[PDB]
Each structure stands twice: as structure tokens, then as C-alpha cells.
Subunit: 292 residues, 2 copies
């Protein structure tokens, strides 16, 4: 399922930075019970950066196992080397995931033609649906609408997580692609505007801690009840902003720990523990949201 509220799930860790199965189970039961549409496993928020490919694969498999068919799982499969992205996709074929979330190469700043060839080749070597992921503030390159339009002609490239926060992109992309191509926000604070403009959902960081409210907001938006959805969005807005007061996923792991959804808020370097002031900011946002 590639519409509605999709959670970019944290990878919960013990004190030693190892994946905590018990916290993961809890998170997954929480999203099943709250009506989250799907789980994105080991994306940015899941600390893809600091897991090796074995741990990455382990987390995804464990996620599917715990999900036990109750919720669709999408694996983060992005890499800045095309051969690496291809190889990582192969690890997940026939695993039971329903699709892949695949980021524009970061750091090496390819041209639009190179992004085209990158994603074309990945899609070529799998039957799994591919969701493109554009986030220029992290990657240093910007996948423009024109190129999204080219890639949408490839059979199994089915959508895009658009994280520019630039809402003019929704209709620039939409007019170049077919009506079954999915447009998903990757910027929590502007996601409802994104959906009001034509977007079909959100791959969300906020959904980690406000799953029910996010699920309902996305359904209201899809039904066109934007004023109703906006009341919810207004109570989540401090969370939408303050979950990035410090680098994601530092605030969201702390929030998960504070709600008792995970055992520890541990991350791997270069991520560092939340500051006292950040705890204060985030706790205030959780309260504004009515979660505490």
C-alpha cells in the first residue's frame, strides 16, 4: 500500500547500539493498531547510514517477521553507487516486502541524466515497485520534475517521496505523469498542504509517535475534508517542526522512549544523545499534540 500515512520507522536499539527486537515488535503492533498504511524499514529515520548491509537486511526481515502480514513493509534500498543499489535490491527480492524506497545518490551529485540511468537500472533488475526519494538538503542533488516524468514511464517506478518542502513540485510532477503515479510528501510540516495540492499521502517521521492522528488526517485529506484534517495538523505542527530541533532521528527516538514505545533512545555515531533543551522542546510538542 502506497497511499495515506506511511511511517518512516525508527530502528530501536539497546544501550550497545544493537537492534532491539522487543522494542521493534512493540512499534509494529502500535502501527497495526493505529491504522498506519505501511512501514518504511531502514530509511533515513531508521539509521540506514550507520547499519551495515547485514544489519540492514536483518532489520527488514525481522520487521516482516513481526509484521506477520498485518501491515505492508517497504525497504529502504538507496545507495550512491548504482551497482550497490542494484545489489541491495537483490537482497530483498522474494523477501515479502511490497516495494522499495530509493534515494537519489548523495554526495557525488550526479546530473539529471545520471539520476535517470541510476533509477532506470535499479528498476530494470527487480519486479518490485520503486518509490523515488528526493531530499536535496541531505543529498546535494535535486531530482527535477522533468526527470521524474521520464522515470515514471518505467513500468515499476510507481511514485516519489518528495522532501524539498517546495509545494510547487506536486503539480509540476503530477502533470508529467500518469494518474496512478503516487505523490507522497517527505516533509511532515508541509504534508497536509502537499496532499491538498494533489498528494496521495506522506512518508512520515511524526507518524512514529502520533500514528492514529496521522492516519486520520491522511484519510480526511484523501476524502477532501481539508479543514477537518487541518485541525489535526495544527495540533501536530509543533511535533512536525520540533522532531528536527536536533538531527533526525535523535528527537523522534527520544519521543518514542518517552512514550514507552521503545526501551532506549540509543543511536549510533555520528548521531549523539538529545540535549536537555531538546528534551524540553520535544516534550512540549508531545503535550501540545495531546500524547503526554
Amino acid at each position: 500500500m502506497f497511499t495515506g500515512s506511511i511511517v518512516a520507522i525508527v530502528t530501536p536499539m539497546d544501550e550497545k547500539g544493537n537492534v532491539c527486537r522487543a522494542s521493534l515488535k512493540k512499534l509494529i503492533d502500535y502501527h497495526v493498531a493505529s491504522g498506519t498504511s505501511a512501514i518504511v524499514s531502514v530509511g533515513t529515520t531508521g539509521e540506514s547510514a550507520t547499519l551495515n548491509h547485514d544489519e540492514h537486511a536483518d532489520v527488514v526481515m525481522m520487521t516482516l517477521d513481526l509484521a506477520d502480514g498485518r501491515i505492508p513493509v517497504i525497504a529502504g534500498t538507496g545507495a550512491n553507487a548504482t551497482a550497490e543499489a542494484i545489489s541491495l535490491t537483490q537482497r530483498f527480492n522474494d523477501s515479502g516486502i511490497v516495494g522499495c524506497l530509493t534515494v537519489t545518490p548523495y554526495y557525488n551529485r550526479p546530473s539529471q541524466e545520471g539520476l535517470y540511468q541510476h533509477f532506470k537500472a535499479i528498476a530494470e533488475h527487480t519486479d518490485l515497485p520503486q518509490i523515488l526519494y528526493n531530499v536535496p538538503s541531505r543529498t546535494g542533488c535535486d531530482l527535477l520534475p522533468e526527470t521524474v516524468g521520464r522515470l515514471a514511464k518505467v513500468k515499476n517506478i510507481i511514485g516519489i517521496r518528495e522532501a524539498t518542502g517546495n509545494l510547487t513540485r506536486v503539480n509540476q510532477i503530477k502533470e508529467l505523469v500518469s494518474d496512478d503515479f503516487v505523490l507522497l510528501s517527505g516533509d511532515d510540516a508541509s504534508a497536509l498542504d502537499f496532499m491538498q495540492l494533489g498528494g496521495h499521502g506522506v512518508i512520515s517521521v511524526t507518524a512514529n509517535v502520533a500514528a492514529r492522528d496521522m492516519a486520520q488526517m491522511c484519510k480526511l485529506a484523501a476524502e477532501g475534508h481539508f479543514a477537518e484534517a487541518r485541525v489535526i495538523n495544527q495540533r501536530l505542527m509543533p511535533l512536525h517542526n520540533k522532531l528536527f530541533v536536533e538531527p533526525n532521528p535523535i528527537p523522534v527516538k527520544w519521543a518514542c522512549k518517552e512514550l514507552g514505545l521503545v526501551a532506549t533512545d540509543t543511536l549510533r555515531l555520528p548521531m549523539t544523545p538529545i540535549t536537555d533543551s531538546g528534551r524540553e522542546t520535544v516534550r512540549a510538542a508531545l503535550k501540545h499534540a495531546g500524547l503526554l
Copy 2:
């Protein structure tokens, strides 16, 4: 050696995308003859993004063997996971490289504290000199002078490649570090200006194809003959710019092949072959530099 003209050397490949030994030797001989001060092996220009760690180590080791003690070799060791950066660094411990060039974590956007802890930990697991590398347009994060000052207190953190193109950084960092802390430009187009402000040299892309001029310019600059160095710079300025007409290292690899320095201009996806319009642009810049 950590002053003067230091080349961020390309990793020449055969048509299969694997390291081309004959081309590498030719490049290293070229830099020996030209008075280049040192080689950075497998940094960004050397396609650190698309080589796996074993291939990366292979290239560094081959470069060192080929250098045969004639010219100092610095290993690119950057990674966005701290554990990974330590592991890559350890491959080169007791190897014959004289130092490491280590970039701020890309993509995951750590805090200043995160950056401090990342580089502190790397430095603690090695005796090799460390050169920090700041390039926010590639990484999505910016290592501020205050944090450079803090890291410069670590025994084996000895300099910075500053690639913001923001010249105000030279004296901001200089006033916070000791006088043997090395300041190196990472932006060819502004590198002479950088040196005029008190910079000690450049880790250069242009030096791949204009090594003699680059060496002479940094020499004149170190002697305080800025008027005279500037004549060289003006001759090289179209290269400083047009070597980024297409994503680095697409133009400089083509330039190398055109100058007969490497056998092929092959790169690994997502880097793509230079366009016809790019060939003409780089050719005019080479001609302006008097190299064609």
C-alpha cells in the same frame, strides 16, 4: 607533505570501470615530474562513492607502490558512519600513507557535537595525521570554525580542506587554531585568494591536468608573489570553472584522456560520459591554459 599543490587524483579506469594500472603510473610519474606536493588517493575526484572498501584500499595501495617514495600519498578515508570511518582508516595504519583526508558525514546531517565526536573517535584509533574536509554542497552539513578549533586540540588532527568557497573561513579558523594547523583550499576557483588570506595550499581538481602551473602558482603564493601567481591563475581560471561544467570528475577525466594522460575516460554510474557540449567547453578551457 601538507602544503603547496596537492592533487585530488582521479582513479583512471579501463572500459570495464576497474582501476587502470598503466594509466595510474603515468599520472603519478606526471605528478612527480611536475612538482605536485602530494596525492590524495580515492577522495571524491577519485570516485570514493562508487568503489567498495576493498577496491578503494586496492587503489590506495597501488598508488603508494607506484609513488615508490617519490611523492607523499594521502588516503581518502571519509564515511558517514563513525564505525565505518574507523574501519577504513585502520586498513591504512602502518601502510606508508602519510595522512588521511576525512569528510564530514554526508546525508545523515549530524550536529556540531556529532561532528566533534565523529572526528575525535577516528583520530583516537590511528596515529596517522588527519585532515578534516568540509564541503556542505555535497554533504548537507557544515563544519563551523568553532568546531574546527575544538578538533584542532586533538594531537593528530592537523589541518582542514575548506571547500565552502567562503573565504571568510580562512581567518575565522586561523584565529582558533595553532600556527602549524594547515589550512587548505578545496575550491580551485578561489584557492589563490584562499592562500592570499593565509591559506597554506590547495587540494586541487585542476592539478590533475595542470600540475606544473598549479605547483608554480602555490610556490609563488607561499613566497608572497601574488601578482605573479595571479597571472597563472587567470590562465587556469576557465579550467577552475569548466572542470565543473558537468559533475566532477566527469570533465577532469575527459581532460586527462584528451591530454593523453589516461587510456580511457570511463566512470562508474551514477557518473555518466561527458556530453558533446561539455567536451567543447573543457577543450576551450584546456586551450586557454595553453595545454592543448
